[PDB]
Amino acid sequence: MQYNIILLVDGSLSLEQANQVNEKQQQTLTNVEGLQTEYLGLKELAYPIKKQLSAHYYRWKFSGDNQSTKDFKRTANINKQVLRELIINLEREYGYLASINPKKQQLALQKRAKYDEIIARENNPENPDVPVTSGLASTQPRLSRTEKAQKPKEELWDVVQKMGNFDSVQANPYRPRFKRFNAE
Amino acid sequence: PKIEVKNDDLELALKKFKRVSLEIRRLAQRHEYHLRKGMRLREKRKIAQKKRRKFRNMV
C-alpha cells in the first residue's frame, strides 16, 4: 500500500525536532519503501492539546506492508514529543481508483484549462463582462456527443422461414365513423 | 456564537443575534426531553419535510 503520516511534534527548536522526526522514522517502519518527508511549517493550531500552542507538521509519503503501522503507532503515544499521528491509507480514501485511472487524470487537466478560461473573461481586466456566464446554463448541446454517440450492438439476424406476409399497413386509426349526413 | 457590535449602532447586533439564537434554541430544546431513536429519526424527517416544502414555494 501507500500510507501517509502527518506527525505532530512539540514546539521546541527546529533543528532538534527534525532529529526527533528522524529518530521516530528510523526506529519503526519494519519494512518500507522510499521515505520522502516534507515540512508544512509553523502554525498556531486551533484547540490547545497537551498544553501546547505551536507544533511542527511533518508529512511522510512512504509505502510498504501492513506491518509498518503497529510498532510506530504504539510508540507515538509513549513519545512525549509527539502530539498526534494519523496513518491515512490513501488506498482507501474517498476516491483513489479514479485517480490512478489515466483517462480521468487527462480529463481533469482539460477541465482545469477550460474552467480557468471562463473565470478570466468574467473577471475581465477592466472591460465589462456582460455575460457573467458561470452558474448559468450553457449554449446548445455539445456537437461532440451528437456524433461520437455510442452505437448499440445491433445483432444482425438472417431470415429463414416466412408465411402470409403482405405488409398491408392499416395505419388509419381513429378514423371517422360518420360519413355523409342524410334525412330519413 | 460571537457577534461584534461594530460600535456603529446597537439594534443591528440584536437584529443578527435574534437569528443566531433561534437556530441555537432549536438544538438546545432538542436535547432537553428523551425520545426513542425511531421517534428522534421521525422528528428529524418531520423538520426536513416542513423546511423542504416551504422552500419549494419560496423558490
Binding site: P152, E154, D158, Q161, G164, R175 | -
Partner: protein
Amino acid sequence: ITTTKPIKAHFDPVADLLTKINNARKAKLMTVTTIASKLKIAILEILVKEGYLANFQVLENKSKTKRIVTFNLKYTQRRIPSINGVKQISKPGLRIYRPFEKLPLVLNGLGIAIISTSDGVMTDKVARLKKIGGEILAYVW
C-alpha cells in the same frame, strides 16, 4: 432484419407465447418478438391457418446458433383484434391428457383448441376427423 434490444423468453413454452399474445392484444400492440422453438413454431403455423394472426416469420442469427420468432397480430381496420381470450390447459406440473371421446369443443367450435397428438400440433376439428387425441396445449377463441 436487425434488432436493438435483448430478447428473452420464459421457460414454460406454451404460456410464454400466450402471455405475449394476451398482453399485446390488451395494450393494442401489434409486433412482438420471442425466442423460437419448434413446438412454438408449429403452434404459430396452425394459428395463421385458422386466421388469428396475420404473419408469422421465424428468423435465425448470423451464426446459426439462435433463432427468434417475431410475430404480429391481425387487427381489423377499426383496430380490434381477432383473439378474444386465451387459456392454457396442459400447464407445467399437471399435464392434461384426454382421449378422443373427451376432446373438448371450445365455444361450440368458434374458438380453436390446440392438440398435439402424434403428428405435431393439431386443431380440434381435424383431430376429430382422424379420431385420435392426445396432449391439449391451450384454448384460443
